[PDB]
Chain length 306, copies 5
Amino acid sequence: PVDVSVSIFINKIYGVNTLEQTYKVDGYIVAQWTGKPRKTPGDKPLIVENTQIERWINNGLWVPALEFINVVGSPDTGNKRLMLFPDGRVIYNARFLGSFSNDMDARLFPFDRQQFVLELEPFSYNNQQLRFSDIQVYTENIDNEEIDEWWIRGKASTHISDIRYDHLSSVQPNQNEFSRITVRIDAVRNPSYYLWSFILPLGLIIAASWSVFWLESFSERLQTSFTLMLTVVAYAFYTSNILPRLPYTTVIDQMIIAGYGSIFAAILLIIFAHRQANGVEDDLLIQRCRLAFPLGFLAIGCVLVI
Amino acid sequence: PVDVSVSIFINKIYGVNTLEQTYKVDGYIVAQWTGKPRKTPGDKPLIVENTQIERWINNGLWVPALEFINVVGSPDTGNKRLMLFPDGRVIYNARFLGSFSNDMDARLFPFDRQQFVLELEPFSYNNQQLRFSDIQVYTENIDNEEIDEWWIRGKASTHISDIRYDHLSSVQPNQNEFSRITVRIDAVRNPSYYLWSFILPLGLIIAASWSVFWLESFSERLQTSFTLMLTVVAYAFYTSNILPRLPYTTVIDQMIIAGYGSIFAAILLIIFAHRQANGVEDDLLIQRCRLAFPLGFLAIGCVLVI
Amino acid sequence: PVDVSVSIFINKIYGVNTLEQTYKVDGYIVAQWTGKPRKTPGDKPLIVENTQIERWINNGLWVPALEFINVVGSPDTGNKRLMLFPDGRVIYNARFLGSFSNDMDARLFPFDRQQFVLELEPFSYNNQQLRFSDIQVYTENIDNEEIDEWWIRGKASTHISDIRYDHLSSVQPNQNEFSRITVRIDAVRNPSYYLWSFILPLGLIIAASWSVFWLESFSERLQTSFTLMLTVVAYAFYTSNILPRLPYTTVIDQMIIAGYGSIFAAILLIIFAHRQANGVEDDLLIQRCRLAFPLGFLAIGCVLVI
Amino acid sequence: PVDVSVSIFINKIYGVNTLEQTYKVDGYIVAQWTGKPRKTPGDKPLIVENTQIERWINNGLWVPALEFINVVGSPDTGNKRLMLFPDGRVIYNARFLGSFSNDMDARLFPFDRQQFVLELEPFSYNNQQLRFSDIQVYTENIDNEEIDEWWIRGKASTHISDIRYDHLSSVQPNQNEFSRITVRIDAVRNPSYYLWSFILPLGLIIAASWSVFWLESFSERLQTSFTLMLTVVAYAFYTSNILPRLPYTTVIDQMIIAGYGSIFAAILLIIFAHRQANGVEDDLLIQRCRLAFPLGFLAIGCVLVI
Amino acid sequence: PVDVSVSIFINKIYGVNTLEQTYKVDGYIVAQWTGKPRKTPGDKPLIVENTQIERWINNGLWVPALEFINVVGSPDTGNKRLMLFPDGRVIYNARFLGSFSNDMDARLFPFDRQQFVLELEPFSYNNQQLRFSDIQVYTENIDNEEIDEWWIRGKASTHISDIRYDHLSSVQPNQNEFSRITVRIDAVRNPSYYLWSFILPLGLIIAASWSVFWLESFSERLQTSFTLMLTVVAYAFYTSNILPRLPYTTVIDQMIIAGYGSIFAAILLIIFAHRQANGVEDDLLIQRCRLAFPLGFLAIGCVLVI
């Protein structure tokens, strides 16, 4: 079995797409193994860059193809180099920018947390072993965090394991285990923008919707309630045109429904006050829910976190 | 005839575009046939990766070109390998990401169901036969489904058939039948998001439009109806800016039209009560349709499913 | 002159862009001509796929380059093959996906009709002739049409002509005519969606805008007219954010202006009745145009189709 | 010095991007120079297409690289050919589609005018001369213009000049002048759509804002003015979501501000009439600016063109 | 150590993406070093363009790979040339268009300032030195500035430094320092558009919201306040659909929140005047904050700049 040591440098993780569950990763990847010795031009180790690499492979040099399992399409590999040491060591260095996939749950959208994973396996060789993996996610941790969109929880955690592919050929008696490197980086979303510019104005509108009971006339309460209904629809539009569309209901999507229900229940209550015989307007209801309707919403919001 | 066995691994099916009738498919494709034996370097089977594959073809190696029929443009092939066995067997392994096309009907948009198909044929050889097809759609079935946007109904169905191309040359006496592998995967759309954040608020607004009859004055009924008219237009905007545009009317598109008619019919009814001579306001109409107008909408909605 | 027979198979025509006047075309293209006989490996005809074609050209094989005239950028060619017959025949088969250009007039947007054209010429040879062109647009005609966005009027029309390039060199005495194949496919847009989800609600809003005259007070008429003005502006937004933006006025764009004018003309009339001395409200005007204003709009709409 | 004659055929100029100052150009480019004679296979001139061109260069053929200066990234070259004449002439013909950059001023947006420029220089040779440039902009001038988005003013003007690159090496005594071909095509924007569907409804809304003074009550004037404020914001939204966003203020952007100012000045005037002691409502102001406020806007609009 | 002199020509810096912290850079890059002399064909220096460069490398020519550190994906290299002087000098000239990354803080959005940086290092050689760097950012400084979106503060500053990569192999005793060229260009955003078309109308809306206290009736004050609430939501939509979305709160985003608070505080004050026993309307409050509410906002705005 061949021993191959990898080193993955993460320069930047950006372009997080919660819908397609994808994220771009820019950086370098280095792999080193020890093979049969070689005569270098001059004793010092040789450097073979980019196009010259394939010429060495055509002459018989062994360079294994390592595939990112969870990658989304072939990544954009920049400069690539081979450092051939005379004692048999071979160091492959390559700059890459690629999009990777991992399951993402963002139902608690403003305060959700995800993990970015990378998975590396040899494409064709099972008789070759990844000896140790060292990541270098030296992006900042306490430089810009309150300003940045994501908060990395800490240095990445690595994991080398063996995967048993069952569905294979009929000629392998026992060789169906491959070496997989699985790196994981925990992260939490910065809720600053989504609190100040979305949850706060929603509360202001939802709270202002309860001030309909402080109007004197019954005719005044129903017509202004229709205007409040339009205002929630207007905010539901703004909150959906700017926020990323998603195939499931988020925390914010629920608050929008909550504002819809608050107003629709008000219209029923206003028409209700029917309730009394001979045209009495049940003024003890308008004044009671004048403060209870704000409280009933606050009581329902706490059971949302049950 | 040459016997070729295929195996298609589906990692992920994403990027479903109901408009262009396309969807992305990521995974691997393997093909195996037995040819003339060969002397390997060492007795064990050889592995030829990526750029080294074309060199063997230039020396005369036969590798048939397999084309995805329903593909949309040349797919993005990742790592490719040839495993040459000495006893004549040849295994072609390739990672691919490609966009495929199939007809999609989504008139019942929140509750529609589609199937994703793959169709594989040899590009130039009719005297060569695809012996058996095995798909490996080992994406989850009971892990994340309520959270996911699509619900796969179950393991994919395979189908090998023969296609008769009529319009061909004049030199083939009888050889105009090609072997087609047809994989089909059934799936149903997750209606959770589209119900809670779209159909539900639509019902609330449509219902609240009927509360115009609980107003006392005739002047009150017409002006608030214009506000209701504006409210439906505002919701038709939000529901069309976030939902995928389509060249036909969906279930939701029909509900939007229904809300328009409900309000316009109300404006006609409010003006109608006108009907009575000497300025009578036909108060038995306002109170009758106060509950009947909600019921007439429910009766028409049931005949929509006729 | 060399005789070259073409055959173009159209799988799918999608991605119609009325703005840039482009449309994607996926399918295969076949060309056959008879050249000097050849010794095949075995008597039967040879098949040369993909990378191996250029090797034969480097050894002197004549393969003419055929250019799509109206193409927009180099198309995406899939699998390509050469079928070399021993008696001299050569069959070139290639799968392609390309974007093509043709002038498009869509002023009658919901009910417009266009034609998709392809234009094929030899790139460098005028002393070579395209003998006959056969298209195979075997997309459905009676399968899905009401569900589909476009209605193909029928099988495509072919056309081989000669183009006289005047501005050329000074060494050709008379050879400046090239063979052009021009394929044309007629099509009509499916107006189902654009009628139900756009033209219909506009009429409802425009008609409901005429219900302002059934209000009793003069103060009531002006304020609801401003709400109607906002409603048309709101609909003008929705109709332009979802429909494709265009550099000219369509049928729908004219109706939008018509709703603007209807309301603006109403505001002038309401203020007019302012006209009468001593504060008379000209009640014979409000009631007359109560029905005439709908009719004047219908009368003006008929002269639009003049 | 080597004499090189160019000929540039412009099929279509589309995709004008006023923001990035870019525009797409599709067409052909031909270049001809006379070199050392050559032995052709057969006496007639040879045609070398696409991949075969590099083989002749590897054997020593001189083909100079001509670079588009104002290009934005490497263009998409279609088919390329070399016509080698035996008397030394060489004709290079290539189809290309590329994006070019040029400064664009569009402050008078609906009625602005621009020019599309091309600049061609040899990439490495200063001891080689571009003898004459002939453009073939045979796009229509009198076919479709009112229907088309841009109006080409007339046939393109050519211009060959010399550029003095100062910052160079230290080994060139005086050879720092290169030959530049500069083609310029004038064009004016079709204001039909932007007049009918934007400037016209803006005037309708702005004018209708002045009808607030024809209301009788002071309470009526302020509340409807707030509705007018919402209508302008709604139109400012519609006019900015469909029109191309720009980093400077256009003619339409100024009218939007003008509508904002008209309404805000009205709100100040309505509150003003606060001005009079003992609660007098200054009815001579409401009626004066009832027509003067429309006139003051018309007077301010004329000084905008000062 | 090899001495390498660079020269970087910047034609244009466009496509600034404050979200992804990226910006496109088009221009040329030149590098010159002196190596072992060579026999040129003729005494004068040779010019090797594009495809012919790799042929010289296959014959043993040393061309070091220089990588842009902060680049985002492989850049688009246009024409590339090698000027081989007989005395050993080698001049590499290449046209490039690439997107570069640098941290961007835009919290003071209309009046923020950024710097565009480029970072160049040899990819594999540490025993090679960049001797001096000369940038040529000869974009205008006094031509178009008020018209342009960004204001370049002045000529770029160069900086050659040494980077100590710690995490390296175990065979380098001390050679882990590479030569880095760091170019920096300061720039300030043109606030003309964002002031006239956004901050100005926002103040107009925010100020007009304070005119609610000049209404006479209490019922009038609350309902028009809801219309103002809808107007701010409408403007928050318009300002967020056109301005670039960002993961943090800007200057404009704070003003939007300020308008939200101004109105919600008004709704509380109107209901407050509850405050007085027996139904007194506290008219000394409505008139006091009639001017104080405008002043309290201005006082809060100054402490925003604290």
